Design a protein around this nucleic acid. Sequence first.
DNA 1: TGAT
Length: 373
Amino acid sequence: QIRNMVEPMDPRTFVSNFNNRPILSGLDTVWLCCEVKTKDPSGPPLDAKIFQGKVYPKAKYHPEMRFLRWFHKWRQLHHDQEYKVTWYVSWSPCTRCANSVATFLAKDPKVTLTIFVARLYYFWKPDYQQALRILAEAGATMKIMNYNEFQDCWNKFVDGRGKPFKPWNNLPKHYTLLQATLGELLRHLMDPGTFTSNFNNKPWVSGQHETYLCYKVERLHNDTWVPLNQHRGFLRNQAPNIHGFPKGRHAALCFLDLIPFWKLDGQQYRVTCFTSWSPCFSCAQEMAKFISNNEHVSLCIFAARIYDDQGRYQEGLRTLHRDGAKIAMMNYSEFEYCWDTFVDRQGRPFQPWDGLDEHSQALSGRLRAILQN
DNA sequence: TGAT
Ligand SMILES: [Zn+2]
Ligand SMILES: [Zn+2]
């Protein structure tokens, strides 16, 4: 058992170091909890270890490098086989560690590595963004720690003394922000079947209510809109869960959560979202609140379909339009743009579904009627 | 809390 393989850390050491507030100052140390397993994952790990290292002065003593050195000697003492390794790390890898791990993974086909991170370290700096992409390209699976992973880390690596994991405040909100930020910097592309199923604008017949939202930013430069290549990606609604958001968090709200986190300066910005469902009343109300308190942001909403929330969605769309949002139904050019930009198309061109233009026309006339009532 |  992992309790016999490692010295479990103090609960205060865990909670202070793994708190997932995205901006968190004062932490002088990186912590790394790991398991080494066979290709069969269910059974107990072959070994488990806790590594720590000061962030400064030298990356060579970061826990990622300590792991690599330990693992290399450990493998000499054990019969060779394929290994799946899991890390729970308090900070994501710096540029030096990301490159060393990437080089190790790239030259060893027998090792597979998954890294769950509590916080993203310097996620806004291009050097760190690039290094995480290099690591992902070497085959490392990078994810944000969620409730289940904090709970698992607590059970395995912490001297909890039988007490259960207790989540800190805003663990879910932090997770969603970091998860969207990670997908952004790794340039995650949306699955093509997922795109086609969710942005098809024919009358909806599935029992599923899910919302996918693609977003982009432009900057005003010399009375011209220029792309801002930094903040481009997609996200989806968060389904309810008592350990996440008990009543869910809709895509439009998760989108609004990102904007302050980008730390846009005082220049004029146009933020565009392509959302498979138009926002419900509560989403459009929060969107209207945002516009009114962020006047350097011009909001543009393109929707594939109009969502009837059985409530005040028509008033919500009217309020959003009057407060200055541009609201429009997606036409062929916007579907093609999202396919070309946000979808893992593997070079394949946009293949429009039957009736795309006719459905866009009917929906545009319905939107027009809503906004003029 | 934008974090030697
Ligand atoms: Zn490092
Ligand atoms: Zn909504």
